[PDB]
Paper text:
[name] (TIM, EC 5.3.1.1) is a key enzyme in glycolysis and catalyzes the reversible isomerization between dihydroxyacetone phosphate (DHAP) and glyceraldehyde 3-phosphate (GAP). The overall structure of OvTIM is similar to that of other known TIMs in that it contains 12 α-helices, three 310-helices, and eight parallel β-sheets, forming a classical α/β barrel fold. In OvTIM, a specific SAD motif (S157–D159) is located between α7 and β6, inducing the formation of a subsequent 310-helix γ2 (D159–I164), although the corresponding region is not conserved in either vertebrate TIMs.
Interestingly, the ΔSAD variant exhibited a lower protein thermal stability, with a Tm of ~3 °C, compared to that of the wild-type. In the ΔSAD variant, the corresponding region (K153–W158) was not defined except for the molecule of the region which is stabilized via an interaction with other symmetry molecules, while the AAA variant showed a similar structure as the wild-type. The electron density of N115 of ΔSAD was not defined and normalized B factor of N115 in ΔSAD structure and wild-type structure were 42.71 Å2 and 16.01 Å2, respectively. These results show that the hydrogen bond between N115 and the main chain of S156 no longer forms because of deletion of the SAD motif. Consequently, the remaining steric hindrance of N115 pushes the α7 so that α7 exhibits a more shifted orientation than that of the wild-type. Furthermore, the efficiency of OvTIM ΔSAD to isomerase DHAP to GAP showed slightly lower than that of wild-type in the quick activity check assay. The overall stability of OvTIM was also affected by the SAD motif and N115 in a complementary manner in that the Tm decrease in the ΔSAD variant was rescued by N115A substitution.
Numbering used by the authors:
A (entry chain A): 5 to 249
B (entry chain B): 2 to 152, 158 to 249
């Protein structure tokens, strides 16, 4: 499985700050075998895509589930491709739990983006109370089912596991905790999709990924890379891109 | 007499592409538009910087939504500071589609509006009641509750008759005027008579070339927040509805 590192800039960006990140990426020494993606705010997708070499993926942080319609404030996969962007992050914890996106809506968005030729990082993960209640797998499998339900092709999907308690808090999952969930999700893929898809699908870890912990997480057999939050805005991102080498 | 500048905003909603945007920009650039009308267009967020470059500053370019802090851990959200950064000075907030499909609360719309204003962005603040709310006699209760959550030189109020938009019913100009008058009276009592006299309240029900002039004549209707017709030649006729 090809190692995959995505940088989620979240709601951070400006012409000046973006240019600084683009310069950092352009002049960085990155393992050529790592797939690298950045996800700027939507206003900046066309300019970031124009300024960054195609070696880097440029992703939207969200999109909707049809090509057009009466959805004030939403953008569609057709629009992403129109501005040269072929990736989207869907189902991020902030969208599910702060902006109230349902499992079903995330599944519909995912099926639509894939149908439109857009690659999807599909995010799943459990809250602290769910983890303490022993419901990590139940939650991850429920969220995965809503994504899997109507999908028949997985070659344009990356799964991102981010425990909600690890997002923005500094409380990174231990490498054993991350490995345990990725292996459980991969074994779910073996029985619910196919062993071939399970062996090839990238499952990346998110949630307080840093230069300091990325190499230990990356060596876990079922961790295939990272979805990076705050550290994607810093030079630390380059070290995370290099975590597998 | 009242002395409010007529205001027409075109909400493109989730419609747009480089090719189709260029056609609309060409249409806007070469049209005969009433010079006394304030004109705004609102493209999908991906296209805001380019639409703002291509359109003369005579036209406002608005985001269709934004969030309530300048930056932070809100994947998929954009802030007023980013709008200013790409040259856009306007945002639509509280649109019925955001309230009812994307589940935005009264409080969240109020927080976004206050923040956008604080950042230096002008706001089209959208309000309006659904069919069962109107049938329950709650038109004013709903509109006033939505207004209170926001509560002005950088605000335009848009009234959306959701009870008509979502059902296929037609709102009459008398029904639009009735709500606009109630909202202006709310502004007069809850803010000030000076603000009430100057604030533009624009109509956000279905507006086409066929009904725009009759709606525009209403004394408390100051323009339109246009839906589907903003993508079509009707938009120019609607911009000219007052003159």
């Amino acid at each position: 499985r090809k190692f995959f590192v995505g940088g989620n800039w979240k709601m951070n960006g400006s012409k000046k700050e973006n240019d600084k990140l683009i310069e950092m990426l352009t002049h960085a020494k990155i393992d050529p075998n790592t797939e690298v993606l950045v996800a700027p705010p939507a206003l900046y997708l066309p300019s970031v895509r124009e300024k960054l070499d195609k070696r880097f993926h440029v992703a939207a942080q969200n999109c909707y589930k049809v090509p057009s319609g009466a959805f004030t404030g939403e953008v569609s996969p057709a629009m992403l491709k129109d501005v040269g962007c072929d990736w989207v992050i869907l189902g991020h914890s902030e969208r599910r739990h702060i902006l109230l996106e349902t499992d079903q809506l995330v599944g519909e968005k995912t099926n639509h983006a894939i149908s439109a030729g857009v690659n999807v990082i599909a995010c799943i993960g459990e809250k602290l109370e769910e983890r303490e209640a022993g419901k990590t797998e139940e939650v991850c499998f429920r969220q995965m089912e809503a994504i899997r339900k109507n999908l028949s092709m997985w070659n344009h999907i990356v799964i991102a596991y981010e425990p909600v308690w690890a997002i923005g808090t500094g409380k990174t999952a231990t490498e054993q905790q991350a490995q345990e969930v990725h292996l459980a999700v991969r074994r779910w893929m073996e029985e619910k999709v196919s062993p071939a898809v399970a062996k090839s699908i990238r499952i990346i870890y998110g949630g307080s990924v840093t230069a300091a912990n990325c190499r230990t997480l990356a060596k876990q057999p079922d961790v295939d890379g990272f979805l990076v939050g705050g550290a994607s805005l810093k030079p630390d991102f380059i070290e995370i891109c290099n975590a597998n080498a």
